[PDB]
Amino acid sequence: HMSVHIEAKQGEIAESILLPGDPLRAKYIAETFLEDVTCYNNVRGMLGFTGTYKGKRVSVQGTGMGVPSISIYVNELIQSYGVKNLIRVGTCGAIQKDVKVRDVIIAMTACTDSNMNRLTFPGFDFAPAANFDLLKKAYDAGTEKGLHVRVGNVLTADVFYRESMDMVKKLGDYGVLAVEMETTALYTLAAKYGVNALSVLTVSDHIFTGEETTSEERQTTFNEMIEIALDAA
Amino acid sequence: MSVHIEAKQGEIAESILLPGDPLRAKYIAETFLEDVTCYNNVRGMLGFTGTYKGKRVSVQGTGMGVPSISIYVNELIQSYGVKNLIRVGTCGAIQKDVKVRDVIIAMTACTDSNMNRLTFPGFDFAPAANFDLLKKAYDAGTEKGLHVRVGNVLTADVFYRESMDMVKKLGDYGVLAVEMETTALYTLAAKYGVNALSVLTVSDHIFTGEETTSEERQTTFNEMIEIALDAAI
Amino acid sequence: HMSVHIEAKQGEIAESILLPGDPLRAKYIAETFLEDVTCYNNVRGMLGFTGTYKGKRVSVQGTGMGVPSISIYVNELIQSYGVKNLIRVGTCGAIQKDVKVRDVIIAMTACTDSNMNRLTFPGFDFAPAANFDLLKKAYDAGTEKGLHVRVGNVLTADVFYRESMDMVKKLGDYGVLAVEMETTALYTLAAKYGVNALSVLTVSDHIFTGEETTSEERQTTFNEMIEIALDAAI
Amino acid sequence: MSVHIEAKQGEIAESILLPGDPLRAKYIAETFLEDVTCYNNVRGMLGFTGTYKGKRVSVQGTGMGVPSISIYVNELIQSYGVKNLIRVGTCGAIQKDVKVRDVIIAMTACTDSNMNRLTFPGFDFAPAANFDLLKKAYDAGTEKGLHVRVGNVLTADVFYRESMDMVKKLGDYGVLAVEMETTALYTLAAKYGVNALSVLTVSDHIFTGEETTSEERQTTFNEMIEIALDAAIQ
Amino acid sequence: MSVHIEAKQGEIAESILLPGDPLRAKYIAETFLEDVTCYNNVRGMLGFTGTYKGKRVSVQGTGMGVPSISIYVNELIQSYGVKNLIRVGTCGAIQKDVKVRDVIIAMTACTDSNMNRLTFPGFDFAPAANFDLLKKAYDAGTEKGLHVRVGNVLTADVFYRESMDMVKKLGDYGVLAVEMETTALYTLAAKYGVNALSVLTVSDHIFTGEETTSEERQTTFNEMIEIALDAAI
Amino acid sequence: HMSVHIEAKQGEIAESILLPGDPLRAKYIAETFLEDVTCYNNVRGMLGFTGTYKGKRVSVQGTGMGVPSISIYVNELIQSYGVKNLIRVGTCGAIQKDVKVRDVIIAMTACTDSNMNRLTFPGFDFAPAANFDLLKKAYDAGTEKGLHVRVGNVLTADVFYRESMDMVKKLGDYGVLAVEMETTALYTLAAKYGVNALSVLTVSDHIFTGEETTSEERQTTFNEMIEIALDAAIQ
Ligand SMILES: [Cl-]
Ligand SMILES: [Cl-]
Ligand SMILES: [Cl-]
Ligand SMILES: [Cl-]
Ligand SMILES: [Cl-]
Ligand SMILES: [Cl-]
């Protein structure tokens, strides 16, 4: 048995997994951080690797952009591959006026403009929570490394190119720290299946102040975040 | 003074415990607090200020449901300079592994209330606990040996619900317990830039039918007040 | 048998009851209007009393503030105590341009920003109606007394402190008379259980003109509202 | 001249009956009115003006459903100065004990329609009948031995509905009958500060299957027409 | 006999045109048909059957709005065995390049009606024209020289709209024109497995204010009915 | 100027473009049907190529899965690279009782699960339409090649693994043909920017009967589908 979008053999994927978004970031992580690495998937070029880190097996799996894409992969990892701990390491755009580029956000929960949870719970606002043990580990370890760590809510957006920004500014005004595109799907599915999830994101740019950052510029932060995510897993 | 509180300026402390029942606000003030004053008896919604471990702290009845607690939180924050707000009380467990006497620290809340859908049309607002407060309570509770569960809760907008299917499904998706206030607190605290948390003792399990008398859970309850006082001070 | 939020013995609560939000107003009503009074409930300080008015037993019960709070008490009064006629008394903020302080509003229906009926009838607007017999009795007693009584819709608001007043202004522009926080709960649950409800409200202030009244300034209008609610109820 | 009515200014009276079917408007004009002119034949949606006890009064056919009656009502009020509007119609009973030939005077309307959700996003809008017209009709209806009931109705967009589950549940919450116009009528009258009422005979029972013939309903219809005409002219 | 149509079985043709106005149905039958019979006078909602190019065909007034047309379409399908239903009439243009006298052939419709949300809670239902009918009508129209535009329309529930900002926004998103019926026709035809289409003449432009009298656009209207008739048979 | 997710120079991408979800499928199309081919992108490994087909420049670009992924690429293609005709080629699951595997669905419109359009038009059901000239072209070309072409509505889903299938079942009862995950985004944005879109889809499986198909079993049908989409895009 393999899932429809992942060609991995049963057992090839570790119980712990990083979800760095771009498949080429998964490759970067595997080559740079992991020993004895296997590439267990190339379907749709969505690279997935298993290797060893401090004597433990651990996986890194590219997902695409957005709730529907990540929901497909997460569903498959949990359901078909028995994956227990899932840490998204990614970027976000700040939407709160004093959040700064290079800040690292640990998502306690996620707001959304997605209908995904509306269908599951008609008439309810479902607010999916992070796994607290993962979150507290990440917080502690990020603080030890001198990362500009914030713990709070984010917005999981369906639309990267949004014509009206009024309501995301408003979410800004109620303390929502940043916007990204996957976290609600990851946290909601982890909760559904009784497994552990966390999103750890770096602010790559500010949506209102215009402040922006280069990927070279985010490299030192990103590398500390991958090590944090790995240790936590 | 505000429309629902007759306190003068300076009669209410910066940090405050927010039970629903005003007779529990009295119990807590008389039990835990020294040099207590009663600054409010409008609507019988008793509120007190005293000292805990030498430090000034208040306790205010909120009444039941989102709309009632919202009035008091708005007025405490806007008129009285309150900065730290901790809801304390009980809840009904709905997740399969949650037990009577467990203490729930809400990371977020789900709701069937329309208060946030009106504010952010088309969005699911996931209101978030203050993390600093939350880590303080968690750490205080764990040091004590309480079975502290950090996760989401359902803020119900109805107590006598016609069907339990949706609350059962929410519990299937990991939602720990049900209560009727925390999304209001978390949302307003976020809106005003102040710090909020909800710490709740499980009095019964809604699906297993495990129940507990308030006498039966008194020392757990006392320890919840303890950790909540520690976190606020 | 006692409900969860009411410690009354079976038979201690009359079939007709007034439902003020404030349990200290419940107490004032009982001591001011009623003979041979008993306080049947102290749980949560949510005072409830039974007394006699014009030779009839009638009750008075604090409900707290908002839909979720009144819905608990109303459910328990009907289900556990066989209460049959339920009259919400209290104040309201005028939003229609011709409504005045001291006017008494009798709610034919209520609009709301509460989710309560949206779970129950998804895709529908449910318009909860007052019991017409009660409504008529109170209107007739009000007009005989000389009160400026107005029959129309009200807003049952879920939020006292509203960031924007644009929508409540628009509702007032569409003839919605006043804003308060309870009556849709009462009307819907009364309808659900086949019992009779009415809200009769004194205007305390006008939200858009700024006209305000103190509780002392309107005590006489309020006391007369209570009399007509008691007359309608018994 | 409005877009759907060809009447010249002054040819339509202040007060108007809305019998639905244009052939009922013609029936009402010919049987009850004197000195009648037909002011409109556009879309065959016949409108007449005549005198009743010395006072001018109109009778205007409207179409089926919220969107059609909204057209006619808007143009009636805005273009022609109509201040009093009375729907004289029929309905289907959805409540277990409501009977055919019962006459329902609607205090409010529930709805299927989206019309009010666009206007008041996030709100349930509950439109109120004019109370003075309503009590007038109730009193006159009861004096004529009509089987009068005062309550809420369901304004439906869909005459032929897949699932009756929810309209059964509305009956269980005391909703009496289903029709297709009054939420529009009551909402627009409120918006423009004018007076409206719906008075409806049960022609069928949606669940028991009981039905009536136009002839079986006639003596009742004729009493309702007289009641509506008097209220119109007073 | 259905409840709103008094016709005998066999008196209504399998192919039918559906103007809103019954007097426009009268005009169509008198202007275009031989051997015409008026088969319905209930509510004065006139319906006719006559012969066009050797073929029996009907014309039936539907009145105005989703709820009216739905009554008529249900009955024609379920009681009278009708197979092809083509709505004819006028529309108000809202897209910037659409002109008066253009003919709109609706591929789909948007709507502010709740009819379909109620049936498919959580979903936007997009009703489809029957492609066969649509292609026939398009070829007939382009053969004739008419400026036929194929795309979407707004099936509006209100004629007198408080604000035009949303219909303006729909025009900006390419929605061609506004009318009040096609969602009902397309959804019901599709539900019962029959064939439907709307072909409409632009009477005016909502935003440019270009307008046309019924007399001024008569020739275009007449050619529109010709192509509808040809498509139907 | 490059867009944020595409590393192409201005003018490297043709005005007509095919949009498979899978980048390795874009590669297959380019290598198999195109001459003089250049790979202009692999940021995120979301491969894009430009080549020539019947003497005309045409491009092929992976979009990824779901409304939010395809919306990103389509926005950037139109706004950053001036693309004008856009055809999604893909597979779908049949949800209507008479639709069969290997049918090719040409989507007139899309129903949806997504809140994308409800946000933009509160209180409205927005129904986005294919470009009709593209649609008519594809239909004629596909029927000539003997494809099992159907013209109708589809469902654009946010969820691949749905817990309950009852609404999609009901949607099928109302004539919706199949389920996929992208076309409401493609049609909506295309119409917003005044450009031309179509989705042409091969049924790979049937949601309710369970009939399934191998990618080998789909290949002759998919190959023809690619050609009619190229034909329709360049004409
Ligand atoms: Cl204990
Ligand atoms: Cl509601
Ligand atoms: Cl007074
Ligand atoms: Cl009509
Ligand atoms: Cl993807
Ligand atoms: Cl073949």
GROMACS .gro file of N, CA, C and O and ligand atoms in nm, chain A residues 44 46 63-65 69 73, chain F residues 21 46 63-66 69, ligand 5:
model
   57
   44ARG      N    1   0.487   1.395  -0.857
   44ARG     CA    2   0.465   1.538  -0.882
   44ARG      C    3   0.584   1.624  -0.846
   44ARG      O    4   0.567   1.742  -0.817
   46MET      N    5   0.717   1.625  -0.570
   46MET     CA    6   0.699   1.668  -0.432
   46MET      C    7   0.789   1.583  -0.343
   46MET      O    8   0.745   1.487  -0.278
   63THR      N    9   0.529   1.982   0.078
   63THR     CA   10   0.386   1.996   0.050
   63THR      C   11   0.370   2.116  -0.045
   63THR      O   12   0.463   2.195  -0.066
   64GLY      N   13   0.254   2.130  -0.105
   64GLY     CA   14   0.237   2.245  -0.194
   64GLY      C   15   0.189   2.364  -0.114
   64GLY      O   16   0.196   2.363   0.008
   65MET      N   17   0.137   2.463  -0.186
   65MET     CA   18   0.082   2.584  -0.124
   65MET      C   19  -0.071   2.578  -0.109
   65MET      O   20  -0.142   2.544  -0.204
   69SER      N   21  -0.387   2.160  -0.083
   69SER     CA   22  -0.263   2.084  -0.111
   69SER      C   23  -0.206   2.016   0.013
   69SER      O   24  -0.184   1.892   0.015
   73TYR      N   25  -0.163   1.583   0.151
   73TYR     CA   26  -0.039   1.521   0.198
   73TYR      C   27  -0.046   1.482   0.345
   73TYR      O   28  -0.002   1.373   0.383
 1188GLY      N   29  -0.170   2.018  -1.336
 1188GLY     CA   30  -0.134   2.034  -1.195
 1188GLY      C   31   0.007   1.986  -1.168
 1188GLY      O   32   0.081   2.046  -1.089
 1213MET      N   33   0.833   2.374  -0.977
 1213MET     CA   34   0.709   2.388  -1.053
 1213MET      C   35   0.741   2.430  -1.196
 1213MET      O   36   0.724   2.546  -1.236
 1230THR      N   37   0.085   2.381  -1.201
 1230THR     CA   38   0.008   2.472  -1.115
 1230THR      C   39  -0.003   2.423  -0.971
 1230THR      O   40  -0.037   2.501  -0.881
 1231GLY      N   41   0.024   2.295  -0.947
 1231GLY     CA   42  -0.001   2.237  -0.815
 1231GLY      C   43  -0.149   2.214  -0.796
 1231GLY      O   44  -0.229   2.239  -0.886
 1232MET      N   45  -0.186   2.168  -0.677
 1232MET     CA   46  -0.322   2.124  -0.648
 1232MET      C   47  -0.398   2.221  -0.558
 1232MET      O   48  -0.345   2.273  -0.460
 1233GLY      N   49  -0.524   2.244  -0.594
 1233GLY     CA   50  -0.616   2.323  -0.514
 1233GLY      C   51  -0.627   2.468  -0.560
 1233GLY      O   52  -0.536   2.521  -0.622
 1236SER      N   53  -0.325   2.725  -0.479
 1236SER     CA   54  -0.204   2.704  -0.558
 1236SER      C   55  -0.225   2.754  -0.703
 1236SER      O   56  -0.153   2.844  -0.749
 1407CL      CL   57   0.033   2.107  -0.479
   0.00000   0.00000   0.00000
